[PDB]
Amino acid sequence: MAATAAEAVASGSGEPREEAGALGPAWDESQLRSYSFPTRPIPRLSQSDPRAEELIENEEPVVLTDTNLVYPALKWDLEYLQENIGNGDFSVYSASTHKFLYYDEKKMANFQNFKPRSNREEMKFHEFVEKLQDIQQRGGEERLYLQQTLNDTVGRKIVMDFLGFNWNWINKQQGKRGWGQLTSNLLLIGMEGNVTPAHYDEQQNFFAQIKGYKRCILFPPDQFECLYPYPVHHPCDRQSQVDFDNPDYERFPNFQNVVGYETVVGPGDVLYIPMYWWHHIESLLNGGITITVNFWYKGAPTPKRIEYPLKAHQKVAIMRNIEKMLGEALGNPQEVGPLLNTMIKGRYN
Amino acid sequence: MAATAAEAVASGSGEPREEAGALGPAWDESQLRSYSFPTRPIPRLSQSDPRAEELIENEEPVVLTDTNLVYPALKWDLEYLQENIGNGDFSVYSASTHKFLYYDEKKMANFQNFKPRSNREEMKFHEFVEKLQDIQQRGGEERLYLQQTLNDTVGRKIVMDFLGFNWNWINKQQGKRGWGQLTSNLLLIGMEGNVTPAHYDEQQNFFAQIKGYKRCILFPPDQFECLYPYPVHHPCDRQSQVDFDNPDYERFPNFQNVVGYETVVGPGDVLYIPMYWWHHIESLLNGGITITVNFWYKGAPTPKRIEYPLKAHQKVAIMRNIEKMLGEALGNPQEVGPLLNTMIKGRYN
Ligand SMILES: O=C(O)CC[C@@H](O)C(=O)O
Ligand SMILES: O=C(O)CC[C@@H](O)C(=O)O
Ligand SMILES: [Fe+2]
Ligand SMILES: [Fe+2]
């Protein structure tokens, strides 16, 4: 039966890997949250494996196990970073829930009836370690998540490690894919259980895991109709409106047909998250703090000639463009919805 | 009660006018078809009346009773035209119903599952008079409607009358409104009872009545949501999908809120039909053949600066543009609908 076969290939992250030296299972199923949709595993390969180069070339996710991309950072931890990252400001988000929904502050002007579930708070690294230390011993329920792009104000040793990254490998990837420039490197340090809701980015991304384990659930661009992203002008643009913990099938019927690709990444693994691919990221339950550094690259330039059929991500690009134009033409983003409905009601639906 | 007051101002074409010389009522209520919506009267004024100049300036319909625009043509009739219009080809549409829905043949390629309710048949004027004579005596049910733009192949006397038109008046109108060039002059000769379904044009129009009487029902551009025009790429683009004789309130709920402006025009009257205004035109029942000549003018150029709020017709222009672009981008007009739905479902509705 194809039914049974389907219930099998939907193995998710599969059997937990064993850490060398018989140090036991990296993690166990109970550390993963439970969702209503099925998921197939993302291929875990060697960077020397042609299949991996094949997946990246075809804009498909793949976990590279031996790139040594951020090898020098694998020694990183709270103590080390505090004594070497510098005294610059670090964006720290606090929240009353395990979900850290991303919001664009420049767009909070278009929607005043919008209040974020998490607030940003700038501070020095030692302060973050402090606020965190407080909560851990105070037994608080508050959750924190540090997300700061690595700037030119970081300490000497941190700059040293940075230089030790495997630029030879990634620079060749950048070149072979025709991608644009490296736009930034985001350092992420979250508490166990933390979750970054499903969303997509308009950048190519090499997601390098350093400390702790993270479960990454991706969805191809062609599942746009099942994930219902917020309006382009809304502050939560590119994020999914669907609450994965309590799906509202009445407002989002097609979320019942969603099928993901998941995997659990650990120290040393690099996950290629293709541009426009949706991704849900959560730090395993009771797994301790997690550390990650991403590498965002501008996508390759759109080809002078346009071949048909268009790819899923090209249609997503068109929809985004329409929403943006209409917002400018109407002189007000709030009127985008009414005009769109007027356009389709009784005409295209 | 505002209810009663509303039921009063909704007088439609009002009391039938009396023809000079005590020749009786021009027409009577029983010659008008019955519809499910209410209608207020269009102002019937003198071209010297400032109020008329006011309405035209504000892009609002008005019937001018004394322009003498097509004074020389008032003598026109089948016999005269046959002996003077020439031997060029005249587009003649035949149909099994009283409704002559307009269709764009260049767009019949995008929709193959579309078959017009009326067919075009080129012929010489004398042939049209023939086919018509046949039906009238044969007691046939077939209906004909001649619609041919006046070209440079018309007879001498017809050209004479043409020259006698009141160009002094209309040329000043064209100049005062900043309108573009005169694009064409359509000659319409239909059988009693004929109907041109509700639709709008992207041209300014001076509709000059010559023979017989016509009931014209207009709807302002802001009633777009109540009239459900076909998709822009469909051959019936700009026409209403709503069957005025048997409205489908299930597919077109807002047609229940539609409110029109009507009037009955006769020999000598000129009806200004502003650009984008919907219009329904029917030749009175048992009123004999009708003759009309319109004057289509390119609208004025869009102002360099755009003031807000936009006017209803500007939003209609934006919607049309979106449909067109999307059709080009997707490489196929048939995919416009699916993409639009994907865009709004669970996001803007
Ligand atoms: O690790 C996370 O919490 C999410 C990061 C992800 O959105 C990215 O683009 O790197
Ligand atoms: O007279 C008619 O049948 C309709 C003509 C009208 O659509 C016009 O644009 O002049
Ligand atoms: Fe992301
Ligand atoms: Fe028309």
SS in 3 state form for chain B? CHHHHHHHHCCCCCCCCECCCCCCECCCHHHCCCCCCCEEECCEECCCCHHHHHHHHCCCCEEECCCCCCHHHHHCCHHHHHCCCCCCCEEEEEECCCECCCCCHHHCCCCCCCCCCEEEEEECHHHHHHHHHHHHHHCCCCEEEEEEECCCCCCHHHHHHHHCCCHHHHHHHHHHHCCCCEEECEEEEECCCCEEEEECCCCEEEEEEEECCEEEEEECHHHHHHHCEECCCCCCECEECCCCCCCCCCCCHHHHHCCEEEEEECCCCEEEECCCCEEEEEECCCCCCEEEEEEEECCCCCCCCCCCCCCHHHHHHHHHHHHHHHHHHCCCHHHHHHHHHHHHCCCCC
C-beta pairs of B333-339 under 8 Å, 24+ apart in sequence? B333/B110, B333/B231, B333/B233, B334/B110, B336/A348, B336/B231, B336/B233, B337/A344, B337/A348, B337/A349, B337/B231, B339/A315, B339/A318, B339/A319
In terms of Cα–Cα distance, which of A308, A252, A261 is closest to A281? A261
In terms of Cα–Cα distance, which of B55, B61, B17 is closest to B267? B17
Task: Write down how long chain A is.
Answer: 349
* CA–CA distances in Å: residue B170 to residues B57, B182, B296: 14, 10, 11
Pocket test for ligand 1, best of A207, A213, A218, A270 (most atoms within 8 A of CB): A207
Sheet holding A39-41, edge to edge: A39-41, A260-265, A214-219, A278-283, A195-199
Residues in a beta bridge with B230: B237
As residues whose CB is below 5 A from the ion ligand 3, the structure lists A 201
**Which ligand sits closest to the CA of A207?**
1
Q: Is A278 exposed, middle or buried (0-12, 13-18, 19+ CB in 10 A)?
A: buried
* CA–CA distances in Å: residue A57 to residues A61, A177, A270: 10, 7, 16
* CA–CA distances in Å: residue A77 to residues A68, A84, B298: 18, 11, 72
Instruction: Give the separation between CA A318 and CA A316, rounded to whole angstroms.
Output: 5
Which distant-in-sequence residues (6+ apart) come within 8 Å of A339 by Cβ? A326, A330, B315, B318, B319
Q: Least CB-CB distance to B340: which of A310, A330, A344?
A: A344
Asked if residue B185 has its Cβ within 6 Å of ligand 2, the reply is: no
Instruction: Give the separation between CA A112 and CA A81, rounded to whole angstroms.
Output: 38
Which distant-in-sequence residues (6+ apart) come within 8 Å of B222 by Cβ? B312
Residue in the block written with tokens 């007051």: B5
Are residues B86 and B155 in contact, defined by beta-carbon separation less than 8 angstroms? yes
Tokens of A225: 């109709």
Are residues B161 and B73 in contact, defined by beta-carbon separation less than 8 angstroms? yes
Computed over its alpha carbons, how large is the radius of gyration of chain A?
21
Q: Least CB-CB distance to B336: which of A308, A323, A348?
A: A348
Asked if residue B239 has its Cβ within 6 Å of ligand 2, the reply is: no
Residues of B whose CB is below 8 A from A224 = 342
What homologous superfamily is domain B1-305 in, according to CATH? Jelly Rolls (2.60.120.10)
Binding residues of A for substrate: 152, 181-183, 201-203, 238-239, 300, 321
Q: Which chain A residue has its CA at the smallest distance from B252's CA?
A: A346
Computed over its alpha carbons, how large is the radius of gyration of chain B?
21
**Amino acid at position B29, single letter:** E
3-class SS letters over A112-136: CCCCCCEEEEEECHHHHHHHHHHHH
Name the CA dihedral angle for B13, B15, B18, B19, rounded to a multiple of 10 degrees: 10
> What is the Å distance from ligand 1's center to A6 Cα?
29
Instruction: Give the separation between CA A315 and CA A299, rounded to whole angstroms.
Output: 16
Q: Which chain A residue has its CA at the smallest distance from B230's CA?
A: A347
> What is the Å distance from ligand 2's center to B174 Cα?
20
CB contact (8 A) between residue A228 and residue B347: yes
Instruction: Give the separation between CA B210 and CA B80, rounded to whole angstroms.
Output: 13
Instruction: Give the separation between CA B270 and CA B39, rounded to whole angstroms.
Output: 20
> What is the Å distance from ligand 2's center to B160 Cα?
24
Residues of B whose CB is below 8 A from A337 = 344, 348-349
Are residues B32 and B285 in contact, defined by beta-carbon separation less than 8 angstroms? yes
Instruction: Give the separation between CA A196 and CA B294, rounded to whole angstroms.
Output: 64
Asked if residue B188 has its Cβ within 6 Å of ligand 2, the reply is: yes
* CA–CA distances in Å: residue B145 to residues A212, B75, B85, B283: 80, 20, 17, 11
Are residues B205 and B322 in contact, defined by beta-carbon separation less than 8 angstroms? no
Instruction: Give the separation between CA B58 and CA B54, rounded to whole angstroms.
Output: 6
Report the relative pairing of strands A62-64 and A44-45 from DSSP bridges. Answer: parallel
Instruction: Give the separation between CA B168 and CA B178, rounded to whole angstroms.
Output: 16
Backbone angles phi, psi at B161, to 5 degrees: -55, -45
CB contact (8 A) between residue B326 and residue A326: no
Instruction: Give the separation between CA A148 and CA A151, rounded to whole angstroms.
Output: 9
Residues of A whose CB is below 8 A from B348 = 231, 336-337, 340-341
* CA–CA distances in Å: residue B338 to residues A344, B326, B345: 10, 11, 10
Measured N-to-C along each axis, helices B312-329 and A312-329 cross at an angle, to the nearest 10 degrees, of 160
Q: Is B77 a known ligand-binding residue?
A: no
* CA–CA distances in Å: residue B314 to residues A339, B200, B306, B308, B320: 12, 14, 10, 11, 10
Q: Is B18 exposed, middle or buried (0-12, 13-18, 19+ CB in 10 A)?
A: exposed
Instruction: Give the separation between CA A196 and CA A216, rounded to whole angstroms.
Output: 10
Q: Is B279 a known ligand-binding residue?
A: yes
> What is the Å distance from ligand 2's center to B143 Cα?
17
Instruction: Give the separation between CA B327 and CA B318, rounded to whole angstroms.
Output: 14
* CA–CA distances in Å: residue B284 to residues B25, B34, B63, B320: 13, 12, 18, 33
Report the relative pairing of strands B39-41 and B260-265 from DSSP bridges. Answer: parallel
Q: What residue spans define the domains of chain B?
A: 1-305, 306-349
Are residues B342 and B348 in contact, defined by beta-carbon separation less than 8 angstroms? no
Instruction: Give the separation between CA A58 and CA A3, rounded to whole angstroms.
Output: 28
Task: Identify whether A309 is preceded by a cis peptide bond (ω within 30 of 0).
Answer: yes
> What is the Å distance from ligand 3's center to A200 Cα?
6
- Which atom number of ligand 2 is nearest to the Cα of residue B196? 3
Asked if residue A292 has its Cβ within 6 Å of ligand 1, the reply is: yes
Report the relative pairing of strands A186-190 and A62-64 from DSSP bridges. Answer: unpaired
Tokens of A266: 């650990």
Q: Is A322 an 8 Å CB contact of chain B?
A: yes
CB contact (8 A) between residue A340 and residue B344: yes
Tokens of A237: 């643009």
Whether the CA torsion B97, B102, B104, B107 is positive or negative: it is negative
Tokens of A170: 């990634």
Residues after which a C–N gap over 2.5 Å breaks chain A: none
Apex B44 CA angle, B38 and B48, nearest 5: 155
Neighbours of B341 (CB within 10 A): 14
Q: Which chain B residue has its CA at the smallest distance from A229's CA?
A: B347
Instruction: Give the separation between CA B214 and CA B338, rounded to whole angstroms.
Output: 41
Tokens of A28: 């166990």
Experimental method: X-ray
Asked if residue B207 has its Cβ within 6 Å of ligand 2, the reply is: yes
Buried b (16+ CB within 10 A) or exposed e, A47-74: beeeebbebbeebbbbbbbebbbbbbbb
Query: Maximum CA pair distance of chain B?
Result: 66
- Which atom number of ligand 2 is nearest to the Cα of residue B186? 10
Report the relative pairing of strands A90-95 and A290-297 from DSSP bridges. Answer: unpaired
Sheet holding B39-41, edge to edge: B39-41, B260-265, B214-219, B278-283, B195-199
Which distant-in-sequence residues (6+ apart) come within 8 Å of A88 by Cβ? A124, A151, A153, A154
3-class SS letters over chain A: CHHHHHHHHCCCCCCCCECCCCCCECCCHHHCCCCCCCEEECCEECCCCHHHHHHHHCCCCEEECCCCCCHHHHHCCHHHHHCCCCCCCEEEEEECCCECCCCCHHHCCCCCCCCCCEEEEEECHHHHHHHHHHHHHHCCCCEEEEEEECCCCCCHHHHHHHHCCCHHHHHHHHHHHCCCCEEECEEEEECCCCEEEEECCCCEEEEEEEECCEEEEEECHHHHHHHCEECCCCCCECEECCCCCCCCCCCCHHHHHCCEEEEEECCCCEEEECCCCEEEEEECCCCCCEEEEEEEECCCCCCCCCCCCCCHHHHHHHHHHHHHHHHHHCCCHHHHHHHHHHHHCCCCC
CB contact (8 A) between residue A344 and residue B339: no
Residue in the block written with tokens 């379904």: B197
Neighbours of A79 (CB within 10 A): 9
For an interface test with A, give the residue of B232, B313, B347 to mutate (most A CBs within 10 A).
B347
Q: Is B228 left (phi over 0), alpha (psi -120 to 50) or beta?
A: left
Residues in a beta bridge with B237: B230
Asked if residue B277 has its Cβ within 6 Å of ligand 2, the reply is: no
Instruction: Give the separation between CA A192 and CA A275, rounded to whole angstroms.
Output: 27
Tokens of B152: 């440079």
Are residues A264 and A25 in contact, defined by beta-carbon separation less than 8 angstroms? no
Tokens of B308: 């807000």
Neighbours of B348 (CB within 10 A): 15
Task: Identify whether B309 is preceded by a cis peptide bond (ω within 30 of 0).
Answer: yes
Instruction: Give the separation between CA B225 and CA B253, rounded to whole angstroms.
Output: 10
CA distance A226 to chain B (A): 9
In terms of Cα–Cα distance, which of A8, A11, A13 is closest to A280? A13
* CA–CA distances in Å: residue A335 to residues A112, A324, B313: 15, 12, 16
Asked if residue A201 has its Cβ within 6 Å of ligand 1, the reply is: yes
Q: Is B9 an 8 Å CB contact of chain A?
A: no
Neighbours of A10 (CB within 10 A): 15
Q: Is A105 exposed, middle or buried (0-12, 13-18, 19+ CB in 10 A)?
A: exposed
Instruction: Give the separation between CA B91 and CA A336, rounded to whole angstroms.
Output: 42
In terms of Cα–Cα distance, which of A144, A130, A135 is closest to A93? A144
Tokens of B272: 């200004």
Q: Domain spanning A306-349 has what CATH number?
A: 1.10.287.1010
Asked if residue A223 has its Cβ within 6 Å of ligand 1, the reply is: no
Residues of B whose CB is below 8 A from A251 = 346
